[PDB]
Amino acid sequence: ESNCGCQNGGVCVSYKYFSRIRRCSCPRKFQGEHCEIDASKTCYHGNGDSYRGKANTDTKGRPCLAWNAPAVLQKPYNAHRPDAISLGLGKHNYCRNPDNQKRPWCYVQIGLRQFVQECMVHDC
């Protein structure tokens, strides 16, 4: 079974000597710490609110910053959010669109600041 946050075919395996810490044992399709990631997805559907894929760059080239980042943890939408699980935001670097917004985006470093830029992921 799963009941640990193990999305999809996730299997919950724990670890006695290491303080019942858990990890999920993912099937091929779903990567990430909960099997939260559909790594087959190549386009996004509609607006993106659902998109859990793995676009990580932006429409100029630049790479996305990790929802982890010490940088990003000041920004409102980031991986520590109490809600972050259901919105796709996690220890990755991908694109999401948790609030509203035409397509999926991510926090991009440019010079010094952290602008929110728009991802690549082609629409269907």
Binding site: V11, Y15, K16, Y17, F18, L73, I85, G90
Partner: protein
């Protein structure tokens, strides 16, 4: 003792331990596979007696590497994080087949290890049945273990090449030594007694009759080693709990309700 606490995706709090807890856990779990490292840290107050410990093994095309680190000072957990032995997990059906991809420890001081956890019905623990890998745990060079009517744990740890290949370890592989213990798991005092708990027939290396407890208030008795009965083991033998008062002695009815 003040010490940062925080599960996986959480931010950290300044937790602050009570009389009993005097160390600061900083467990990290990592995985590599097809150049994707993903690493999950949890921190919090530790306890009286836990030990800088390390484990790693491989399931399929990946390596998971658990490590634990403790210290007895204020917020000493914070922001930032060779010898061959057989490997495999029960999970991917690899420790059970007469074949199992192997591995080589990356720290001197590491060991070779087999860890067994066998549980019945809807089992309280999400732990592989059999695991073989590299690393150091409580009371290493040597062995620990304890069996109950419905449960059987056992560790084995050695400083010699592939010291852990060959046959796995079931129940029947142990010589009913002849000595006995008790097995109890209901609730509090009257879930089990001289009435709803019976004498187990102790098996081989197990010869210590043992009890366990913690505060809602879970309790367990049976047949164990002297290494098991000592150190961190027993404690983690179940989800979480107190100072988990624990007891050992010689005798068949050693562990009968006192």
């Amino acid at each position: 003792l003040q010490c940062m606490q925080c599960e996986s995706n959480q931010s950290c709090l300044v937790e602050e331990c009570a009389l009993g807890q005097d160390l600061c856990r900083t467990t990290v779990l990592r995985e590599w596979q097809d150049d994707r490292e993903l690493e999950v840290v949890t921190r919090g107050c530790a306890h009286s007696e836990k030990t800088n410990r390390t484990m790693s093994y491989r399931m399929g095309s990946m390596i998971i590497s658990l490590t634990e680190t403790v210290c007895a000072t204020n917020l000493c957990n914070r922001p930032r994080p060779y010898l061959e032995c057989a490997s495999c997990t029960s999970l991917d059906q690899s420790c059970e087949r007469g074949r199992e991809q192997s591995l080589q420890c990356r720290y001197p001081t590491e060991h070779c290890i087999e860890v067994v956890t066998l549980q019945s019905t809807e089992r309280s623990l999400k732990d592989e049945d059999y695991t073989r890998g590299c690393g150091s745990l409580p009371g290493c060079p040597g062995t620990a273990g304890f069996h109950s009517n419905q449960t059987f744990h056992f560790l084995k740890c050695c400083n010699y090449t592939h010291c852990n290949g060959g046959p796995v370890l079931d129940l029947q592989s142990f010589p009913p030594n002849g000595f006995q213990c008790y097995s109890c798991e209901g609730n509090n005092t009257l879930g089990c007694s001289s009435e709803e708990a019976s004498l187990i027939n102790c098996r081989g290396p197990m010869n210590q009759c043992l009890v366990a407890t913690g505060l809602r208030s879970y309790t367990v008795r049976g047949c164990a080693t002297a290494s098991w009965c000592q150190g961190s083991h027993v404690a983690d033998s179940f989800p979480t709990h107190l100072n988990v008062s624990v007891s050992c002695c010689h005798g068949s009815g050693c562990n009968s309700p006192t």
